[PDB]
Amino acid sequence: STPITGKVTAVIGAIVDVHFEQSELPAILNALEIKTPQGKLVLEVAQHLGENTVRTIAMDGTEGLVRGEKVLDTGGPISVPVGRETLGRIINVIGEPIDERGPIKSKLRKPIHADPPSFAEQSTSAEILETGIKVVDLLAPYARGGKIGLFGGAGVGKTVFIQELINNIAKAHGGFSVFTGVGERTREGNDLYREMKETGVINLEGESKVALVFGQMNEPPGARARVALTGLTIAEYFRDEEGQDVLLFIDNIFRFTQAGSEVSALLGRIPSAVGYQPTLATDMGLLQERITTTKKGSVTSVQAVYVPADDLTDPAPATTFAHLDATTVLSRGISELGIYPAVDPLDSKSRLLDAAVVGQEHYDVASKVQETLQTYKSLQDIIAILGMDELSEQDKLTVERARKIQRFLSQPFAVAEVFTGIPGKLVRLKDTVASFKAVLEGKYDNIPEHAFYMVGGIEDVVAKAEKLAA
Amino acid sequence: NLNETGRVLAVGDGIARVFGLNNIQAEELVEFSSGVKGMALNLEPGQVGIVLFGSDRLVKEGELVKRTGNIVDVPVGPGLLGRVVDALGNPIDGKGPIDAAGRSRAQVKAPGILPRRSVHEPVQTGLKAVDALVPIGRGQRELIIGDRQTGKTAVALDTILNQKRWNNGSDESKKLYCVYVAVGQKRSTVAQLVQTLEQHDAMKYSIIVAATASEAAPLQYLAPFTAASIGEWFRDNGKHALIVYDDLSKQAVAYRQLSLLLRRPPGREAYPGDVFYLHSRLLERAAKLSEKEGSGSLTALPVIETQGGDVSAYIPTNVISITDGQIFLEAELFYKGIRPAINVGLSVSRVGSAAQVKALKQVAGSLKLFLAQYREVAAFAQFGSDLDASTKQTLVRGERLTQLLKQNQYSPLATEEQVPLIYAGVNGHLDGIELSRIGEFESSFLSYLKSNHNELLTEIREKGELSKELLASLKSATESFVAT
Amino acid sequence: NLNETGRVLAVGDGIARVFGLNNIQAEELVEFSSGVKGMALNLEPGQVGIVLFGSDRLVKEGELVKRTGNIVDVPVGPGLLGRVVDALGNPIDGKGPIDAAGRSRAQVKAPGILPRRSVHEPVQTGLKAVDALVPIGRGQRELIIGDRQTGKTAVALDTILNQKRWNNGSDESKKLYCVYVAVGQKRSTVAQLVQTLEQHDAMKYSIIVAATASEAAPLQYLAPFTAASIGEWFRDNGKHALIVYDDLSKQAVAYRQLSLLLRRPPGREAYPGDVFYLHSRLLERAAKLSEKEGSGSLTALPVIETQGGDVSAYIPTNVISITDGQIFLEAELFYKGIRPAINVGLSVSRVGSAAQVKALKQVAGSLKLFLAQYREVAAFAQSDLDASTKQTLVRGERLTQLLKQNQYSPLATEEQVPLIYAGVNGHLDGIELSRIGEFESSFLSYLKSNHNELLTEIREKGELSKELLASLKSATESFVAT
């Protein structure tokens, strides 16, 4: 015991100023604790205002706080338990359990703020991670070790998509996985924890393959602003010290930026554009750059990205693009056609779509599919105005083929059975390319449009074609 | 003794700065010597910043201010049923003292990841369009958004009225108690409304909570929270409440007002930085508890008012992404005769079919997608180039389906009234009938089904699921009638 | 003491306010007790306003701060070629200390009105579309602009990859040293951009100044000036560099962060008044110096990222009005499959004519003409067109096809001029539009074996004889017949 004490001097919403004796201040990013009637209240030092006073941010609700109340310096950043002991557990922002299964008995804890790996620690690999999802694996294929963002305005299917990923990827994956819930719906989290148990991925009386870190929107900005790093640290630990493969699921990473937004002014910063904090770029940088494959081990991350007001050029998402190896853009226009997943086949991109990585044929199919749809998009002016009548014959066929193709890009997810009542179909990457190849050369021009919609591989196109013609 | 008391330094605009109150809590209640109550929101170093629940003519510099020692809180329990209370839960109807089973705080942690379940019970609104297209579930939060004067309140109201079906029964677990929060409404308008609730014997199972236009910004901002607690009682105690927040746009207008005057620096459109947090924490308080916790639900219908149809403005955007789906009402739709002016195109329930009744689900197979395809073909119709037998076909059905979902205000329908209508439309028995006459079809049909095949109507109801033979009887029954 | 040292009054958000340091110069680098460096930007009556280069967790109230009596400078000189540095000149690639020919301040006056000559030597990028239609001169400032993911970096990188032609040779005045300023990029990206030039043996004559996503804003603010001064070394020493700023958008964002935090007053989009002055200073430093100055040169490829195509956007406005033109990218053209995705109608080089391999300019004065008229009769692609506007659509498709070019494969001039010749003078109108792919490959390899001599004359003379025009014509008509 050599404990440092301070006193609360202000509370303004989520900002709590604390005062300490002579030059003996806890450094920025340190955690402080206040022992309250129910549990404790964690603070995080944000500035040194001067005159022995610090500005903090609260990892909880600040009501009930009394000025002049004792504050305790933990001596360092917020700590999380790490390692295999976090497997099968649910954790809140401050490395405390919320599953009521008792204390997380790990040997090490770790600071949630940490430095991002040096330029010289980086590891470039063009390896390909098969999703099972037709449009991704064909057009914008996800990279093992990569980073992978899912852009989408509200309710276009991000969370469902990401769960379809977990449904597939997270079984076939030999290693461990962290899921971070950053400012989503407490009930979504509820489902996941009950799915994990039933998929088997979690097992409360045996071995588990995943850690759960939650900080949903029912929680104040400070908390919603750090729980990403809480999760991210657990991952880091398996990457660097279990020297192995991780899968890092963040839903939804936009709320890290938003939460940053909600306290910015209270910390006394002039707003930048679209009322976002001045530190948007570097703050996102400072997090994203830790989520990374390095020589000691590999992370592969799937981050849902909220696109506010469906505006992609909104400073927040617009910044995130630079951070991802593969971008899956969900679109309202697409989803409104009943085309699930709502993936925009043109605006979706992945670095791995290069002949050197996937072969020429794959790259050629993928390019042609794109040309097709691009043409079909370009002609939608002349179709509206002068009908389908006023068209070149090649065009009439390009459109015929584009429409058939649009549909073959949809697919029943397993997760989304509640919505389609249609059984989840998973498609193999080679089966994807072959069927699109076939479609493209016209070896299927006779089959009606509906036969391609909400089915798996070309088997299912034939099966449906006949079942309907019956 | 400046620990439990302070003197006033300056007072203006609902705000009082106050020297002292040393032991005071953030968000604590204080009485002023004059009578008027207030809440501490800015415990700064020299002084405390207080929002008042009253007028301020009555507060002067130097006047002594007093610690309560409590955080804002409300009476709860089924004693509230039938009562019209202000933000702090004081009778304002005239019916005398509230009897409460206890007191909750206005801010309460939402139930965690841990004690919840899947939404699987319907909250039947009796609104054809809604109960077939965007079915709402016991536990889910569902946004009602559109411009001014579009019918937002009307949707919420027609939902409440409907619960009569179950509340006059004795099966406590089929019941749905309603809480209607009036935020920024004029008083007479809350009046005009409780009247209608009574005209429909609907007041015995509701609790209105009113923070009208004239009340203090703090009360307006608070109401939804206090209200959330009033109905949290029901959820915690094995029952199901329904909370209508009419409407959050105003709560935020007021929450903006506390902050600008407390001088906290502003966010976008002068709102505070965490105007999102404001709503998120309220709306998360709606949930459907697990068996261990009593299976109680709380269901939320927030309302939001847009301008010029813009949903991309600050607040709507915030709430739009907070809730489990929206119902968009539109003025254009309205004036051309679709009422409810629901926009199928844009309205969703993210729970979906999980909360639809099995029977309704069965005959509503694909309707919502089809209705989309219908707008599709109707947009291509504007080319006024000749139609084929496929497009004319779906146009005839979509037009009749559209028309079949129109509904008069104040008339929620039983499921078994809804089901045969939907079935008649979907399986295309309506398709050879004049469009102006579909009005008369509806009631004339129901009249006949009650009269004759009542045994079906009562099975649908009792069973909620159309067995294969019941589809038969219904199939026969419809054809029969369409030949007049 | 307080003339050479100060005391931190307060610290947060990358900024620290410090008492004293009374003798400090504006923009002097300083050092903190913990060892993190920072620079002094606001010199106020009572206090200095220092911006941090590292995490401010390192800094506490009351801490000691030391002057370094040093305006930010950087090591410069050829010992830097093939190296990957951060914005202060530090080595970030595990290759030991930089061997600096000297040091230059990050800030330097642009060469004035007097010590410049008119731009007159080509930067040959290898890209058919660019070299032929948007010719870049040495000392020029051509701006690369488009929305995200359109191809901006690819254009720059192919310029860099195309310099092997000369950099591997002997003749100094003909080589060109590459400087790639990476701003606020994912380190793994940079790593891979390195791993890409080394895969083309381009590293040996390139310099990467790296100011990655996660580094203090000052470094992201500084990097381009820092790298600017690296380029000028070559300029000032009778040599030639070219410098790619990837990107200026993100530099402006950085400058913004600093200012707002220093609570300098904001304007449009919360940028400070002198955000223009920021970029003008940068790009005015690029030039073709006059004979008296060693006739060296510095060419500039700033990257600017539009948002949904908005050229009126605050930053793009400033920058567009500083540069000598733009190479313009569009995802539309990109998904059509036209890569490089160069909008020709929107791309200009104010320098233009004067900077083109005379030979390429000889067989292409017609090219901008044809593609102009092809843009105007384009919508006629949908049954009853007269033979004139039919023909115009016949060239255009083929021509557009001819300017597609897989990544990383830039073409030698003597390899461009034949294809652009057979195109413009109507030797492809016969050929179908899908075969224009294999046409180029087979033509060039045939020209190599059976006409290596004409190719050699183009590469050497740089112009086309009346004889050479009949030579090529004959060799073409022979290949097109075959």
Ligand SMILES: Nc1ncnc2c1ncn2[C@@H]1O[C@H](COP(=O)(O)OP(=O)(O)NP(=O)(O)O)[C@@H](O)[C@H]1O
């Ligand atoms: N199904 C309906 N049929 C006919 N009129 C309706 C229907 N639903 C609502 N209205 C009418 O339209 C008017 C305004 O409806 P209202 O339910 O107040 O929408 P609102 O969005 O709440 N308007 P407000 O909140 O005052 O800006 C009322 O007079 C209703 O009578």
Ligand SMILES: Nc1ncnc2c1ncn2[C@@H]1O[C@H](COP(=O)(O)OP(=O)(O)NP(=O)(O)O)[C@@H](O)[C@H]1O
């Ligand atoms: N594959 C799918 N099939 C059918 N419906 C889907 C699919 N994906 C999404 N949806 C529908 O769209 C709704 C929203 O899905 P969801 O994944 O919650 O959107 P979201 O973009 O994650 N919402 P948010 O997290 O606020 O941005 C659901 O309720 C489904 O009806």
Ligand SMILES: Nc1ncnc2c1ncn2[C@@H]1O[C@H](COP(=O)(O)OP(=O)(O)NP(=O)(O)O)[C@@H](O)[C@H]1O
């Ligand atoms: N000529 C080309 N042929 C084929 N592919 C290309 C060509 N140019 C670019 N690409 C590809 O298209 C994608 C976009 O190119 P890129 O150089 O990243 O543009 P950018 O403006 O730098 N995108 P970013 O800066 O990351 O927002 C890359 O993934 C390349 O693989």
Ligand SMILES: [Mg+2]
């Ligand atoms: Mg979601």
Ligand SMILES: [Mg+2]
């Ligand atoms: Mg209303």
Ligand SMILES: [Mg+2]
């Ligand atoms: Mg780039």
